[PDB]
Amino acid sequence: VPRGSHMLDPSELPSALIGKPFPAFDLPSVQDPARRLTEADLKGKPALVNVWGTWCPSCRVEHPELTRLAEQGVVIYGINYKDDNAAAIKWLNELHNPYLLSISDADGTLGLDLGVYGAPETYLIDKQGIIRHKIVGVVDQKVWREQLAPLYQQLLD
Q: Where are the domains of the chain?
A: 1-157
State the DSSP code for 130: B
Angstrom distance (rounded) from CA 148 to CA 136:
12
Centroid of chain to Cα 70? 14
CB atoms within 10 A of CB 96: 11
DSSP letters for 13-39 = STTTTTTSBPPP-EEEBSS-TTSEEEG
CB atoms within 10 A of CB 48: 24
- CATH H-level, domain 1-157: superfamily: Glutaredoxin (3.40.30.10)
Nearest C-alpha neighbor of 37 from the set 52, 25, 53, 47: 25
The most distant pair of C-alpha atoms in the chain lies apart, rounded to whole Å, by 52
Give the count of alpha carbons within 13 A of 75, CB side only: 17
Nearest C-alpha neighbor of 37 from the set 132, 122, 105: 105
Asked if 134 and 116 count as a contact pair (C-beta separation under 8 A), the reply is no
Nearest C-alpha neighbor of 125 from the set 51, 26, 71: 51
C-alpha separations of 99 from 10, 12, 14, 19, 33 in Å = 29, 24, 22, 24, 17
